[PDB]
Amino acid sequence: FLGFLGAAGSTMGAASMTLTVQARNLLSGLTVWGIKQLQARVLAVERYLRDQQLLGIWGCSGKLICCTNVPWNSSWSNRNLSEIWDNMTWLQWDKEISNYTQIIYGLLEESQNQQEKNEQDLLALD
Amino acid sequence: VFLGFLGAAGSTMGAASMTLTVQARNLLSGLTVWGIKQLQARVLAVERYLRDQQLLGIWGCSGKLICCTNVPWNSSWSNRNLSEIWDNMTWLQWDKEISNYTQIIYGLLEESQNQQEKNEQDLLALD
Amino acid sequence: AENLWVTVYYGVPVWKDAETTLFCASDAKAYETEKHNVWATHACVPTDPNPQEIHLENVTEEFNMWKNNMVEQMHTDIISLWDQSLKPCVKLTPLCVTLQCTNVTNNITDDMRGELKNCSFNMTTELRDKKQKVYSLFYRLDVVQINENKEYRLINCNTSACTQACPKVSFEPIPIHYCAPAGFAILKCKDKKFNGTGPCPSVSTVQCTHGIKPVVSTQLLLNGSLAEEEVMIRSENITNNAKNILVQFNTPVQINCTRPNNNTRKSIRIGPGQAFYATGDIIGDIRQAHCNVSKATWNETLGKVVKQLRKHFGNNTIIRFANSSGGDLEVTTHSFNCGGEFFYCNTSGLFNSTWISNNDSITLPCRIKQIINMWQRIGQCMYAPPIQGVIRCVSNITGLILTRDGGSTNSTTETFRPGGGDMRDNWRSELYKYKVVKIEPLGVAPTRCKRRV
Amino acid sequence: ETFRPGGGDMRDNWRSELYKYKVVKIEPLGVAPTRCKRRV
Amino acid sequence: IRSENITNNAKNILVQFNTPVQINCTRPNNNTRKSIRIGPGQAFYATG
Amino acid sequence: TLQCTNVTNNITDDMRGELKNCSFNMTTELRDKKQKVYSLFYRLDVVQ
Amino acid sequence: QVQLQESGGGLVQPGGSLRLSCVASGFDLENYSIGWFRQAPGKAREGVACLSKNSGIGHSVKGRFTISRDGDSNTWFLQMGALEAEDTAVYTCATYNRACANYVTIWPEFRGQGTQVTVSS
Ligand SMILES: *[C@@H]1O[C@H](CO)[C@@H](O[C@@H]2O[C@H](CO)[C@@H](O[C@@H]3O[C@H](CO)[C@@H](O)[C@H](O)[C@@H]3O)[C@H](O)[C@H]2NC(C)=O)[C@H](O)[C@H]1NC(C)=O
Ligand SMILES: *[C@@H]1O[C@H](CO)[C@@H](O[C@@H]2O[C@H](CO)[C@@H](O)[C@H](O)[C@H]2NC(C)=O)[C@H](O)[C@H]1NC(C)=O
Ligand SMILES: *[C@@H]1O[C@H](CO)[C@@H](O[C@@H]2O[C@H](CO)[C@@H](O)[C@H](O)[C@H]2NC(C)=O)[C@H](O)[C@H]1NC(C)=O
Ligand SMILES: *[C@@H]1O[C@H](CO)[C@@H](O[C@@H]2O[C@H](CO)[C@@H](O)[C@H](O)[C@H]2NC(C)=O)[C@H](O)[C@H]1NC(C)=O
Ligand SMILES: *[C@@H]1O[C@H](CO)[C@@H](O[C@@H]2O[C@H](CO)[C@@H](O)[C@H](O)[C@H]2NC(C)=O)[C@H](O)[C@H]1NC(C)=O
Ligand SMILES: *[C@@H]1O[C@H](CO)[C@@H](O[C@@H]2O[C@H](CO)[C@@H](O)[C@H](O)[C@H]2NC(C)=O)[C@H](O)[C@H]1NC(C)=O
Ligand SMILES: *[C@@H]1O[C@H](CO)[C@@H](O[C@@H]2O[C@H](CO)[C@@H](O)[C@H](O)[C@H]2NC(C)=O)[C@H](O)[C@H]1NC(C)=O
Ligand SMILES: *[C@@H]1O[C@H](CO)[C@@H](O[C@@H]2O[C@H](CO)[C@@H](O)[C@H](O)[C@H]2NC(C)=O)[C@H](O)[C@H]1NC(C)=O
Ligand SMILES: *[C@@H]1O[C@H](CO)[C@@H](O[C@@H]2O[C@H](CO)[C@@H](O)[C@H](O)[C@H]2NC(C)=O)[C@H](O)[C@H]1NC(C)=O
Ligand SMILES: *[C@@H]1O[C@H](CO)[C@@H](O)[C@H](O)[C@H]1NC(C)=O
Ligand SMILES: *[C@@H]1O[C@H](CO)[C@@H](O)[C@H](O)[C@H]1NC(C)=O
Ligand SMILES: *[C@@H]1O[C@H](CO)[C@@H](O)[C@H](O)[C@H]1NC(C)=O
Ligand SMILES: *[C@@H]1O[C@H](CO)[C@@H](O)[C@H](O)[C@H]1NC(C)=O
Ligand SMILES: *[C@@H]1O[C@H](CO)[C@@H](O)[C@H](O)[C@H]1NC(C)=O
Ligand SMILES: *[C@@H]1O[C@H](CO)[C@@H](O)[C@H](O)[C@H]1NC(C)=O
Ligand SMILES: *[C@@H]1O[C@H](CO)[C@@H](O)[C@H](O)[C@H]1NC(C)=O
Ligand SMILES: *[C@@H]1O[C@H](CO)[C@@H](O)[C@H](O)[C@H]1NC(C)=O
Ligand SMILES: *[C@@H]1O[C@H](CO)[C@@H](O)[C@H](O)[C@H]1NC(C)=O
Ligand SMILES: *[C@@H]1O[C@H](CO)[C@@H](O)[C@H](O)[C@H]1NC(C)=O
Ligand SMILES: *[C@@H]1O[C@H](CO)[C@@H](O)[C@H](O)[C@H]1NC(C)=O
Ligand SMILES: *[C@@H]1O[C@H](CO)[C@@H](O)[C@H](O)[C@H]1NC(C)=O
Ligand SMILES: *[C@@H]1O[C@H](CO)[C@@H](O)[C@H](O)[C@H]1NC(C)=O
Ligand SMILES: *[C@@H]1O[C@H](CO)[C@@H](O)[C@H](O)[C@H]1NC(C)=O
Ligand SMILES: *[C@@H]1O[C@H](CO)[C@@H](O)[C@H](O)[C@H]1NC(C)=O
Ligand SMILES: *[C@@H]1O[C@H](CO)[C@@H](O)[C@H](O)[C@H]1NC(C)=O
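Structure tokens for the assembled complex are given below, as produced in the milestone run.
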């Protein structure tokens, strides 16, 4: 089969099948080659923990595909559906939406909080 | 009771599946000599624990201790009775028996989890 | 039942053999009123007030004494703690001017004829301009003749230069515990009949080791840990003539001795801040240091050792002991340490007997050396400063490092001679019932589940 | 046009072996629209 | 032919060949190194 | 302060000058006596 | 491999000198120290020299015999002078303990075969 980053040239539709390959190895593994190397082994775990906490608070923690509330706003991108998932690559998608990935991270948190409060009060009532 | 680290390491598998908490609660306990020596291990332990947790999370798992899964037994890995496995041997013997059939299992589990994820995602669409 | 499905179990009791780095655990003993130690335990963390051990059962785990990584991990920590504690004090290079030495005849005894020498030389004072004429007493083991009141020279300003030991610190051993980090376990064998490369069907787990003193000696272990029942014989492979026989005693043998000579250290200045503590004026008679052992104890301990040893070499054999037959000066003589002064006693009155199949005390003469070269290397030494008064030491002979001669085809004339070599058999006699294991928790097992969707 | 040999900074003997290379930081997280709704 | 901006007079013009051009050379002598003593342990090796 | 003279042992006109005999005093391992050693030094490592 | 290869045997006029040497390899001549044997007919085994590692000292049992080494070359030179009528034996070079433990009495492992040295007018 393919390998690391092997589908980075593939289309978006077929890219959502090798998510495990590019997610399994984010945690791989005095004098020079001493503390300089030791910096990286701490930075990597810090970045991974931050990414997991972000995939946390929103409400997911199952990794991979985890689809959710906060419906799409057409102002971000007025495009079709098959236009996005069959004739594009993830790099182009990032280039198209790079400045708008700052308000979504705030909407998801409050949506998760509302869902949690609804569930908690519904359970505690009865 | 029969507490303590590795307390039931000699007990049978039937009663060993009760102290999984004890053997997993302390996996993350915490320029001269006794200097960088401590710091060379306090990072390795964290990395090992994180890798184990990520491996558990990749499959359909991470409830925690006991986790059900698909991909049935191939029936060639061990031609043994169920009561034979679960009431007469210890965990070390089981590791010695299956030390070297696990590599394909570690991929079977993840491909099954991916299939289940895709099934859920495309089932949640038509409705 | 008819359906068998895999299942992932987390945290099951499964371990493998691996290696890692262990750390300190030393008893606090307040430690505020301390005079420092070369084996600095201030960096070490406080220990558990009460270590807890969990008794396992049903488990038989194989051990090994000669392929243990704990020993090789310890030998690079004593050395590293030694080099670190000799850096921040005086580094006297200007001590090897042409010494103009003579003899000493101040009420000496014929046993100590020669030996001590009256050396006299020139030093640079604190100012970089003037010179002073000083004198000292130097043992015959620290000066060599040159240009053969003949001029002498320190034996060391020919290959290296050495830093006088920091005078505040002391060489007193203190118990130290080695504890493994999280994710590892310390298995300990509790069988009383352990013999080296053999499984222990009683192995338990312990938080970490008991207090073990980093003592240094040769051909006679001191202040060691005894064993139950009878004396024990351990070896790598006891059919060869090039493998040690680490005997372990049962009843301790007391050895004790002193240096019956008054000594008054006198301090001189060689530069800005640095000082040099040289000896001068021995107040009283002159006698040699000697160590006493009790004959009534050795006379039976050797018998017990030979009775246990006759197991592997047949029953009708004449076991014979002998003294060391030559080698370096650290292997052929007892080389213990006593209160900052390094003795080199001459053990030839003990290994003297022949054993057939079918109050009085022993005195061992000694010599004193100051230019020591422990942790045998090329390019270092340490001038051990003189100390005042008379020192006495009482010590516990729990061990022996005999080696065989053999080789003369098959016969019955087995001779044993003491012998050292690498200073790694003084720690393979305290870290033999231990091993370090890495726990691997994740496991797979079949059961009757389906994970219904 | 005249050409003369000339060195300078000791950095053109390593810009001749590390020229067809680059290092990239992989950022995994992503957002895309699809046809779901998290059902409670 | 590679360059930072090849129209200037102050930028190197790196050239990468296709076939190697073998170059030989040797020093046609025997020096013999003698060793003298500087102090305690140190040595200085000087042509002789 | 080196005391240096020329070399005239089967020299070649292409390598005229260049090498130089150089004698000097050096401290021995003892902090008291001084040696008297010589060496051969190239013309690129000594200045007048 | 460790086995030792020896050379330099011959016949000597009483009042001469030899240059006995032996060379070996085997990726393990860093832990060991190499000495020499002496076996004459009718007598037991003795020792003649042992170049101890960790000290560089040249221990010997008689004043004449001296052991020596040169650089990192894996060859050892045993220099003997003023030989007498008693120095007629079989000379072998073997490996001793790391600090030249008991020799003139031990029987080591990883030993050589041995040359022949005879003295006569
Ligand atoms: C083996 O263990 C024994 C017992 O600890 C050691 O003997 C002890 O040696 C120390 C150091 O010389 C003695 O400490 C000294 O005590 C005197 C008198 O209190 C004091 O004036 C000194 O300043 C110093 O603190 C200690 O007294 C002595 N123990 C006994 C019972 O006399 C022995 O040294 C150990 N073996 C080796 C090789 O170190
Ligand atoms: C060792 O040598 C020193 C000096 O060489 C001796 O000290 C001398 O002692 C006499 C009296 O016995 C004095 O008159 C001298 O003035 C001293 N010399 C100096 C330089 O002060 C010392 O006696 C000798 N013997 C011993 C045991 O120290
Ligand atoms: C223990 O030491 C003896 C030494 O005699 C070893 O026996 C020798 O083994 C080598 C290699 O197999 C043979 O070349 C020798 O001929 C053997 N000597 C004798 C007298 O038989 C023995 O192998 C060692 N034990 C282990 C487990 O290695
Ligand atoms: C080691 O030192 C101890 C203590 O100084 C000696 O033990 C004492 O020996 C005398 C002998 O006259 C007895 O009267 C004492 O009763 C002993 N002390 C104790 C506490 O029993 C011992 O003799 C020394 N070692 C040797 C070999 O003499
Ligand atoms: C071992 O013991 C023997 C004899 O008990 C010692 O041999 C003596 O050594 C001295 C020192 O050179 C000689 O003067 C004697 O002539 C030797 N005697 C004999 C009979 O050979 C030997 O020195 C001792 N070894 C050690 C290391 O102490
Ligand atoms: C070590 O002790 C032995 C045992 O006494 C010493 O051997 C004696 O040394 C004296 C000293 O001249 C000789 O006269 C004797 O002939 C030796 N043998 C015996 C049996 O007494 C030995 O000299 C001591 N020193 C060394 C370095 O071995
Ligand atoms: C490459 O170098 C040339 C130099 O010849 C640059 O052109 C000069 O640019 C500066 C600043 O814009 C002007 O002041 C000069 O007049 C220009 N020179 C000429 C001859 O027109 C050119 O800009 C450089 N290329 C890049 C991409 O910076
Ligand atoms: C470089 O080339 C020159 C000339 O081809 C070589 O000089 C020759 O050296 C040989 C060997 O000593 C002489 O027999 C010739 O007479 C020399 N030719 C001359 C001086 O014109 C020189 O050896 C070469 N250097 C190398 C190959 O390192
Ligand atoms: C460099 O200097 C040395 C020493 O000054 C010269 O060696 C001398 O050579 C002459 C004969 O050529 C001898 O008589 C002297 O005894 C030598 N000196 C010493 C100290 O032994 C040498 O000639 C000079 N030149 C070169 C090229 O080495
Ligand atoms: C690359 O582009 C070609 C042309 O559109 C396409 O057929 C192919 O699937 C793409 N991906 C890969 C991995 O070749
Ligand atoms: C140990 O073995 C005995 C003997 O079969 C068994 O009864 C016991 O359950 C085992 N486990 C423990 C913890 O004793
Ligand atoms: C596992 O053990 C060895 C180690 O690779 C292997 O040869 C063997 O085939 C495996 N076990 C079985 C039952 O095949
Ligand atoms: C001085 O001691 C030396 C020891 O080496 C001895 O040889 C010499 O005879 C002694 N001389 C006197 C006068 O005591
Ligand atoms: C010490 O220096 C003085 C200076 O006058 C000198 O006379 C004396 O010989 C020196 N001592 C030695 C070299 O032992
Ligand atoms: C000085 O050290 C060397 C070893 O480097 C040794 O051979 C020699 O005997 C020592 N003594 C001298 C040169 O006086
Ligand atoms: C220890 O005992 C076992 C028991 O079989 C034996 O195989 C081994 O050789 C012994 N080791 C020794 C005596 O050093
Ligand atoms: C050792 O014993 C001798 C005689 O037995 C005695 O003269 C001496 O004082 C003793 N020394 C010590 C330190 O016990
Ligand atoms: C040693 O000297 C000190 C100080 O002069 C003195 O108090 C002590 O009694 C002396 N020791 C002996 C045994 O005379
Ligand atoms: C003491 O040594 C003698 C001499 O070998 C021996 O005969 C005797 O048996 C020994 N004492 C004991 C109690 O064995
Ligand atoms: C032991 O030493 C004594 C003298 O100290 C001596 O008479 C005896 O012969 C020695 N033992 C042997 C076996 O030679
Ligand atoms: C030496 O052994 C005796 C007898 O067991 C013991 O009382 C003493 O404490 C030991 N010495 C030590 C441990 O320093
Ligand atoms: C490299 O080639 C590109 C092709 O468009 C050109 O624009 C650029 O100037 C070139 N760089 C050089 C020649 O340094
Ligand atoms: C140069 O010097 C060495 C050193 O003795 C000598 O062996 C050699 O033959 C000389 N000539 C050459 C061409 O190496
Ligand atoms: C020595 O060499 C120098 C180098 O420039 C030169 O000037 C001088 O004339 C030479 N003298 C002799 C005597 O060779
Ligand atoms: C070396 O020292 C001596 C001392 O006698 C002196 O005569 C000579 O000139 C010195 N050499 C120099 C300064 O080159």
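DSSP finds two helices and 32 strands in chain C. Residues 69-84 of chain C form the longest helix (16 residues). Further analysis is deferred to the final report.
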